[PDB]
Amino acid sequence: ILVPRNTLLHEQWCDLLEENSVDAVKVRSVVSCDTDFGVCAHCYGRDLARGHIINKGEAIGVIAAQSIGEPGTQLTMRESSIQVKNKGSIKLSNVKSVVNSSGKLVITSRNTELKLIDEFGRTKESYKVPYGAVLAK
Amino acid sequence: KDLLKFLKAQTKTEEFDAIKIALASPDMIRSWSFGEVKKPETINYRTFKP
Amino acid sequence: TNLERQQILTEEQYLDALEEFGDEFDAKMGAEAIQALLKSMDLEQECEQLREELNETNSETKRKKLTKRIKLLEAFVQSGNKPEWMILTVLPVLPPDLRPL
Amino acid sequence: AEISGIVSFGKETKGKRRLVITPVDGSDPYEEMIPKWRQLNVFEGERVERGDVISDGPEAPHDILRLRGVHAVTRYIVNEVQDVYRLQGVKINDKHIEVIVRQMLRKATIVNAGSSDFLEGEQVEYSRVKIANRELEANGKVGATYSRDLLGITKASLATESFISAASFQETTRVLTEAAVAGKRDELRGLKENVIVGRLIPAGTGYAYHQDRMRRRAAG
Amino acid sequence: HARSTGSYSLVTQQPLGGKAQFGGQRFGEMEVWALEAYGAAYTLQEMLTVKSDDVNGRTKMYKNIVDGNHQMEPGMPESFNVLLKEIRSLGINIELED
Amino acid sequence: LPVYQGETTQTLQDYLMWQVELTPFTDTDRAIATSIVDAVDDTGYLTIQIE
Numbered sequence: 001i002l003v004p005r006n007t008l009l010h011e012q013w014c015d016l017l018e019e020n021s022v023d024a025v026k027v028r029s030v031v032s033c034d035t036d037f038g039v040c041a042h043c044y045g046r047d048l049a050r051g052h053i054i055n056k057g058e059a060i061g062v063i064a065a066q067s068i069g070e071p072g073t074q075l076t077m078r079e080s081s082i083q084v085k086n087k088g089s090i091k092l093s094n095v096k097s098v099v100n101s102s103g104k105l106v107i108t109s110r111n112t113e114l115k116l117i118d119e120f121g122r123t124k125e126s127y128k129v130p131y132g133a134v135l136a137k
Numbered sequence: 138k139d140l141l142k143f144l145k146a147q148t149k150t151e152e153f154d155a156i157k158i159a160l161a162s163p164d165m166i167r168s169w170s171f172g173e174v175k176k177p178e179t180i181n182y183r184t185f186k187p
Numbered sequence: 188t189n190l191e192r193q194q195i196l197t198e199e200q201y202l203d204a205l206e207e208f209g210d211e212f213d214a215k216m217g218a219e220a221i222q223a224l225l226k227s228m229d230l231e232q233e234c235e236q237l238r239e240e241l242n243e244t245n246s247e248t249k250r251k252k253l254t255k256r257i258k259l260l261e262a263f264v265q266s267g268n269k270p271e272w273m274i275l276t277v278l279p280v281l282p283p284d285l286r287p288l
Numbered sequence: 289a290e291i292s293g294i295v296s297f298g299k300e301t302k303g304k305r306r307l308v309i310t311p312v313d314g315s316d317p318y319e320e321m322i323p324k325w326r327q328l329n330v331f332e333g334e335r336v337e338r339g340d341v342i343s344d345g346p347e348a349p350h351d352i353l354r355l356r357g358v359h360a361v362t363r364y365i366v367n368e369v370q371d372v373y374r375l376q377g378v379k380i381n382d383k384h385i386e387v388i389v390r391q392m393l394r395k396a397t398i399v400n401a402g403s404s405d406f407l408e409g410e411q412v413e414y415s416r417v418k419i420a421n422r423e424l425e426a427n428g429k430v431g432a433t434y435s436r437d438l439l440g441i442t443k444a445s446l447a448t449e450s451f452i453s454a455a456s457f458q459e460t461t462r463v464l465t466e467a468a469v470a471g472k473r474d475e476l477r478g479l480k481e482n483v484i485v486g487r488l489i490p491a492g493t494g495y496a497y498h499q500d501r502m503r504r505r506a507a508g
Numbered sequence: 509h510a511r512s513t514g515s516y517s518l519v520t521q522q523p524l525g526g527k528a529q530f531g532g533q534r535f536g537e538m539e540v541w542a543l544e545a546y547g548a549a550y551t552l553q554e555m556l557t558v559k560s561d562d563v564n565g566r567t568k569m570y571k572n573i574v575d576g577n578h579q580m581e582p583g584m585p586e587s588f589n590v591l592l593k594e595i596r597s598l599g600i601n602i603e604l605e606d
Numbered sequence: 607l608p609v610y611q612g613e614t615t616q617t618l619q620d621y622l623m624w625q626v627e628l629t630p631f632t633d634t635d636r637a638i639a640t641s642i643v644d645a646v647d648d649t650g651y652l653t654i655q656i657e
Contacts (some may be wrong), residue, residue, distance in 0.1 A: 030386030032359075035416060039390070047381055057495030059479075061391070062545045064384045071378055094558070110331065110341065131331070135302070140637035148564050150584035153604030154505075158451050158467035158484075161601035162269040163277030168465040169596060174280030179288065266471030273469070275599050285593060286608055287519070314560040468600060479544065486585050492547015519612020567627060574628070 006042065008053065021120035079132060085124040088116020090137065100134065107133040188212035192225065218274070226271050234260045289343075290355060291318030295335030353393060353438035361438070362389050393438035395447060402432025412436050450474040450481040513570070520587055521561030557582035618650075621644050 003013055003018055006072040044060060054060065088099030093115065097106035113128035167173070180187060188195060188208040196204055196214040204212045237257040241250060263270055289501025294347040299308030299317040299321075300480065309322035311317050322343075329343035347390070371476050373380045396412030404410075404418050415434050422502040439447065448454030451467040451476035474481055482489035482498075490498035514532050515524030524531035535555070543552060558569050558580045568581050595602035616624070626639050645653040 030383060031390045036413070045383060047383060057489060057490065057492070057499075057547075059544065059547065060383070061387055062541070064387045066541060066545075067380065067384050068388070071373070071376065073371075074376065108331075108334070110329065110336075111360070139633075140542055140640070141633035144633075144636065144640070148583065150582075151604065152606050153574065153584070154476060154606065156452055156476060157471065158464070158473070158595075158602075159266060159471035160268040160270075160272050160468045161275070162272030163275055163597060166275065166277035166279060166600055169601070170277075170279045172280070175276070179283070202538070218534065229396055262470060266469070268469070273599070279597065282593065285590070287610075287612070464595075464598070464600070483544075483552070483556075484585075485588070486553070486560075486582060489544070489549060489552065491544060492549045494547065494549035498548065515613055517609075518614035521611035521614070522612070524613060574620045584623065 008045070022123060023121060079130055082127050082129070084116060084127075086116065086118045088118055088124055090135065091115035091117065091123075092135075095133075102134065104135045107131045107135075221257060222274055228270070230260050230264050234264075234266070241252065289318070289320045290338060291316060291320065291342050293336035293338065295330045295332065297330065306507075339386060349440070358393065358436060362386065362440065365389060372381060392440065392444065393436060394444070395437055395439060397435040397437040398432055399435065400433030402434075403427060403430030404432045409437075410434070413506075450476065450478045452476065452481045452484065453478050513566075516561050516563065516566065520590065521563060553582060554580050556585065561586055619646050622646075 002017060002022065007013070025072055028034045028040075028043040030039055030043060033040035039060075041056065041058075044054060044058070048054065048063065052132045054063075082105070091114050092107075093111075094109065095112035096106075098106035100106040107129065108131060110131055112133055113126045115126060116124040118124065188204070188211045190204065190208075190212050194214075196212070198216075201212075201214040204214060234257050237253050237260070241253045241257065244253075289311065289313065292312040294312030294314065296310035297307055298310065300306045304321045305323040305325060307330075308321045308325075309319055310322055310328075310330060311320045311451070316391050324364050327344055334470075340351075347364075352364055356364070362385075366382055366389075370380065370382060378503055394412055396415055397408050398402055398405075398410060398415070401407070404415070413431065414488060415419065419432065445457050446463075447452060448457075451463070451472045453472075454460075455463055455467075457463075476482060476485055476487060479489050479491050481487075482491070482494075486499035488494045488501060509527035509530075511527075511530040511532055514530055514564075517524070518521065523534070527532065540552075543555075557565055562569075562583065565581055565583055571577075572579055592602045622643055623640070626643075631639060639648070642652070647653045
């Protein structure tokens, strides 16, 4: 185990989990805070001038809602190439393999997506390919 | 009027809670209105009165 | 008379109707026609009929616009508002301290 | 499509367009009318399985909400948003994005009344409160099948509780009529309601002010 | 330009205008929402009761401000009464229960 | 519009009342002063006698 059920990622678990090569974070969140009114603060946080979680009654949408509206600096009025960044694996992720004319396995599932594993679960890219994909390696 | 509460009676505010909105029928139109209108003149220029 | 209760009977049509059926076919052009027309729009039987139809007569169009009627009915009911009130009768006069000069 | 997933073809000419229905038997086959306008994605065998796959065209919002769901749909939304934010160079916290969603997808759509009400368009949260209060307490059997419906902004504003609020939103002439015919009540629960009213907005410290006030009002 | 007791209007006992007869500004909505971000509840309370049209409120306020009492008496907004009339002016029975 | 400029005024007697409010006064004192104010002439002379 790396962490408890109820804990707030203060500062040091960051390095610890980065060591564990754990990239997915299952957390309770907005709405996911089952609260019956707004959200439970257990799924809300601090993220602000208080490094301490927002106190009760916190109007997060207030902290929001202009948070987006600030971005008024926006803009208006508007299969063959696969490249590898570092060392990695194939990681077809449940791609159907079929008998092929050449010395490889065909792709029959339309859901094919690769992944490159260099040294840990951390990857470089996906480089998904169609059913016309042929495994060169 | 004792002139102390009659002056004092002017100012008070309630809870007023749970403001509602619903339709209305003319009997209460008579009720709320302290009167009904009859003439299209508003004031005089000869004496400048209601 | 062979005229629908809510039957559009044009002025010439109304004249011919009064001539033919005599004083039997009531036809009007005033809004008070509507004043009555809603004043005689019972909610209970109408809602029961709409419910029976939507439960029975169901289609891509029959399931719709009928429960809409049922819902408008249930709303005007549970509210308790005098519906003919919406066709108001008594008109207030502006308080001049609002409607100033 | 998610009913009976083996590639098919046919209904090239019907009341609909070319290749209207290409469903399979599967389990409980459904009649999926496919215009098959630009191109298709029909495969030879095991073309698909349970769930929905993109055959052709950009995705649609209700599509992800209804078939994909939410937390994944929330993921898709947050992705599509932080993408432009990065293309802008913004620094935007995503708890914001989750909040925006939490506003957006309410009034879940119901096929089963579940002894609650035989209609459509109820606060998914109100649905949940009712489901907890009735299924757990007395009738677990009173199960209302509800489909969490995502709602867009330009209307979901109208989904407001205090007729005081939402009144001006863009207009209210109809809304005033609606409040009336509804016999509708503002209830002064909200912040904008308190504001124009000028009452202890359950806001800032006024959270506690309205808190003690509500404690009194339950007492009365 | 500044003014501490500016002309509350005859209509809405609203400010005279902008320095027009020692008139003043009108607050900003984005800012007021930001103020909600403060949850500056007393600030809002005075801004709409102390800092609104209130003859019955500005009077007691000036009296206390002289008196060093340091309190504000909100009562009830009068623009509320005006709109409530406009509702009763429209086809609406408008009232508030207890 | 319905309001245009919509600015109220003192009309003097209420200006006197403004000072009376800041002046220390009792309920009977306020009532007597207000009654005195009620029957007041434009010239600023007392319309009714003390009696």
